Design a binder for this molecule. Structure first.
Ligand SMILES: NC(=O)c1ccc[n+]([C@@H]2O[C@H](COP(=O)([O-])OP(=O)(O)OC[C@H]3O[C@@H](n4cnc5c(N)ncnc54)[C@H](O)[C@@H]3O)[C@@H](O)[C@H]2O)c1
Ligand SMILES: NC(=O)c1ccc[n+]([C@@H]2O[C@H](COP(=O)([O-])OP(=O)(O)OC[C@H]3O[C@@H](n4cnc5c(N)ncnc54)[C@H](O)[C@@H]3O)[C@@H](O)[C@H]2O)c1
Ligand SMILES: O=C(O)/C=C/c1c[nH]cn1
Ligand SMILES: O=C(O)/C=C/c1c[nH]cn1
Lengths: 545, 545
């Protein structure tokens, strides 16, 4: 029987802050792409190191007092420590390796030995809310491209992408919300069907000709459509190049970061991957890397024929370069090219979860946002769209990109709504780690920083320490695993709006500092949007020169 | 005019917790090996990124309120954030680079660009107390060797080492406190004289024959002696091999971790190093690496002739291997070979500083320890020796290795002594980062862990987050710079015992968790001393299997 988050108002823990974390753990497994292996998303991002660790985490949370801290180490609960009730209930650090040892080869060996797990960004910290977590980011990428290259509209524009997994599955809905005709190549029919049946996906086919006919009809009419094509991206993309078909936009969101558990090489059936991992994992990686190289060569050709081509944050260019595509980094990254003006003001992927399990709670917050942020036409547009079109996945939840001060405003209003019984139960707040002071990754978040600080990992470490100092409920530091090993370090944070007045202080303190450090990180690198935000919001940026 | 720590009881800041950190900053510069370059020790471990950063840190500390946190990033003050008064006053993260970019070459380039500094372990967190900080560790190494190989006594035993810098300068006194005849090779006459005049060193010479005559007379009589020999270790060590002279113990504590600013190659004069760094830094590194290789070859030969040979934590074996010494790691590391049974109980380099500047404060704490820990003959022996023989360096301070619960006991007694006026002024507590949950370094602290977890850097990240959650005054996360780039990540903590009852809670909470996580880190790796300590001290170690 599949794990699901507890619904309703019956506490299993000593309080609602503890219960919230337990339900978020259950919720990432409920929305997980392979719950049975503790895998939440991204092929091998796990919620805990193993089932023994999971059960001991669950036991510990049920007995944890508000003035204690549980320490979790690469997904394994280690000990319980006395702190105080304005300190995190959990601090965790997942898959951190000292630099010269931070290689994929070392990662697999240590995971085999039982010593670590990769936590993804939001898997091991239990902050994943389903595909919705990434859908506004992708939609904002598509809209930024529209503004930059297509007069503000993707109507009649053709997007090609691949991957309909935990995160990739958001792309068809992001595409059609932006008015685009979007073709998503996916190797697993199982995944195609899942997205069809949750209505992230409109149409499916096994025929490329049929898919292109549908795309053509939509483009010609300026209608949106999403098509899932069963196939391998390293076969389909070169074929479009052969046919001289250049989409207007091309990206990829396959699991290219991991050549053992992620990217399916050309000529392999999904059914034989386990077999291949067991017998000859080395050949499988070589085959996956060669197929990624073919796919990116096709992307590069599409780029030269005029497509807007970009990396959607999966190290696909890094992999392609390793397997011989020397100009792979001619392809843009979505951060530097499209979203960095948002990050520079610490506008980022803020999210919240209705721990009661009641969708009416999300809808009440939706209505609050439309009323209280009505001068913010971006968030107002997004919330209208999400309320109408994003289905419930696990616990009702909402993604909503907010910047400095706005996160705090929302969370304080919601906490009061919990306190006043306008919401049925407490609300958990969190975010992706793809946020201003909380991620360092030279080929994703921090590629080509203005000051060259691409590799500086101080910032997420600072974000974690400051958030611990700011009364958050859960704080985490992650580093890359699998093919992300050695590429990134990030930090996450969870807050529980349980209605109490003491939570008001925690929410205010953490959220102002979580975004505040984000603004200063980009201000330090010389971004003028950040310097403007500092003045607008009276952030205390220290001047030295 | 040289920077010195303020003495006396006049506050320059808004409170004594803030003043304590300001004085510790001044104090590491006062005891610094090259204050003029902000360099505290270890060739390039700096207290701040640059003088502009230093002045802005000083200004900020003078105005910082107890409910605020200053964020420092690789030695540069970034911003001031509202937290609460049971949160750190400072969180800092120094010289952290994502793994694939954590190389010495990247480090130098980024330091050149003005983007980072190496913080050492205790330099950028202002936790260095002078040479005393390391002297008990070295003495415990020598005593462990004595127990293992020489019937409990180094009387009549010959120790050969090199390096009389910030940390290396402790070796002659550690040697003679243990009864040994110790020869210290040092290239700079300036350094030799400094140690002579602070009485860390008994005798100096420029003649190897004279040095060996002195060593021989002492050995023969079972007397202790310390001799500083002006010379290059890569010349002297092979010469002893040539002469068939095998000391009983051989180590090195030169700055072998950095081939640009540290290790002086054979045939270079110290006077020309600056010139060489400017013109041809690449040749200088090659020359330094070749000379380290020669020195370690000599060490390896001495080992085969029966010397107890070990690496004293300066990556000398790593460097030697890189420059061709394939069996360099046949030489023991002091952690795994001698001190790990202490680390396994979180016994570690705890230290405290009399912020009043009054030596009588240290002496009162000394007397307290002798009375309150009298069943602990190890600490009782050490304190007697240190009070008698360790000179004051900068602010009066004391090193004293204590384990779980004992650190807390000491700090609570001292805080009460501050409160009751038995001490003139507040006391700062800290430690080296060479401590149980606070250091990851596969070729120093965590070489050859029982469970193979040598590379896992989760633990210092956890130590920092938990200490932030535990009401510490300053928390830091550092990673390696120079030749340490990619090798290590560590965490430090500072507490201010200012006498208040609220500080009692902070000191208790932080110290129990700083050592408590340390015990659990070694317990997790399977060390039986740790499992014993857990039971003895009722540490809440979670069981999963
Ligand atoms: N680290 C970041 O900053 C960041 C941010 C957002 C997304 N992501 C990345 O998004 C990528 C995907 O995330 P996920 O959660 O969707 O992964 P997931 O593994 O759940 O799904 C990956 C999908 O790709 C399919 N696939 C694999 N090889 C294929 C091929 N050759 N052709 C077609 N389809 C193929 C798989 O069948 C699966 O459905 C990952 O690399 C994740 O890291 C990363
Ligand atoms: N990272 C750890 O875990 C740890 C712990 C303790 C000590 N240490 C290391 O101890 C080593 C020294 O620390 P420090 O603070 O003494 O450095 P320091 O640079 O102040 O002094 C180094 C001394 O070595 C001398 N020297 C350089 N090359 C020489 C040569 N070829 N022959 C003789 N003398 C030579 C220099 O003149 C200087 O006096 C460093 O590598 C530091 O990291 C490291
Ligand atoms: O939105 C999430 O939960 C995760 C986003 C992400 C991207 N890459 C890894 N995790
Ligand atoms: O005792 C100190 O202050 C520093 C010890 C240390 C060892 N290596 C780097 N710092």
């Amino acid at each position: 029987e599949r794990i699901t988050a507890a619904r309703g108002l019956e506490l299993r823990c000593k309080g609602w802050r503890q219960e919230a974390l337990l339900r978020m753990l259950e919720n990432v497994l409920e929305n997980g792409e392979n719950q049975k292996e503790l895998i939440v998303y991204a092929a091998l991002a796990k919620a805990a190191r193993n089932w023994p660790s999971y059960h001991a985490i669950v036991r510990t949370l049920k007995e944890l007092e508000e003035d204690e801290t549980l320490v979790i180490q690469s997904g394994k609960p280690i000990g319980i420590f006395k702190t105080h009730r304005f300190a995190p209930l959990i601090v965790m650090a997942n898959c951190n390796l000292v630099g010269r040892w931070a290689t994929s080869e070392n990662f697999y060996r240590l995971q085999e030995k039982g010593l670590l797990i990769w936590g993804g960004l939001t898997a091991a910290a239990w902050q994943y809310i389903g595909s919705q977590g990434v859908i506004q980011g992708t939609y904002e990428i598509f809209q930024s491209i529209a503004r930059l290259h297509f007069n503000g509209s993707l109507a009649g524009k053709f997007i090609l992408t691949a991957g309909l997994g935990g995160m990739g599955g958001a792309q068809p809905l992001a595409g059609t919300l932006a008015g685009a005709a979007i073709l998503c190549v996916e190797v697993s029919e199982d995944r195609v069907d899942r997205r069809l049946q949750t209505n992230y996906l409109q149409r499916k086919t096994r025929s490329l000709d049929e898919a292109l006919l549908w795309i053509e009809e939509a483009v010609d009419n300026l209608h949106p459509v999403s098509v899932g094509l069963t196939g391998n991206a390293s076969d389909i993309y070169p074929e479009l190049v052969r046919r001289g078909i250049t989409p207007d936009i091309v990206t990829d969101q396959t699991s290219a970061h991991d050549l053992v558990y992620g990217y399916v090489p050309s000529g392999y059936r999904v059914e034989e991957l386990e077999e291949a991992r067991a017998n000859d994992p080395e050949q499988l990686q070589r085959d996956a890397g060669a197929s990624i190289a073919v796919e990116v060569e096709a992307m590069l050709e599409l780029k030269k024929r005029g497509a807007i081509v970009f990396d959607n944050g999966n190290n696909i260019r890094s992999q392609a370069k390793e397997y011989g595509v020397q100009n792979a980094f001619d392809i843009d990254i979505f951060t530097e090219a499209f979203l960095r003006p948002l990050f520079a003001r610490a506008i980022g992927p803020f999210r919240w979860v209705a721990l009661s399990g009641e969708l009416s709670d999300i809808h009440a917050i939706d209505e609050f946002i439309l009323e209280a942020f009505s001068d913010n036409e971006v968030i107002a547009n997004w919330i209208r769209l999400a309320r109408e079109h994003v289905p419930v996945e696990g616990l009702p939840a909402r993604i909503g990109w907010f910047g400095h001060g706005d996160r705090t405003k929302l969370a304080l209003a919601v906490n009061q709504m919990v306190r006043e019984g306008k919401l049925q139960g407490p609300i958990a707040f969190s975010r992706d780690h793809l946020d201003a002071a909380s991620m360092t990754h030279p080929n994703i978040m921090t590629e080509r920083m203005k000051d060259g600080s691409d590799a500086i990992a101080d910032w997420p470490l600072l974000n974690a320490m400051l958030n611990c100092s700011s009364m958050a409920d859960l704080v985490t530091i992650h580093s890359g695993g699998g093919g992300y090993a050695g590429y990134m370090t990030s930090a996450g944070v969870t807050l529980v709006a349980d209605g109490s007045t003491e939570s008001d202080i925690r929410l205010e303190t953490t959220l102002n500092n979580d975004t505040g450090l984000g603004v200063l990180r980009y201000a330090d690198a010389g971004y003028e949007e950040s310097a403007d935000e500092v003045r607008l919001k009276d952030i205390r940026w220290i001047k030295t020169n």
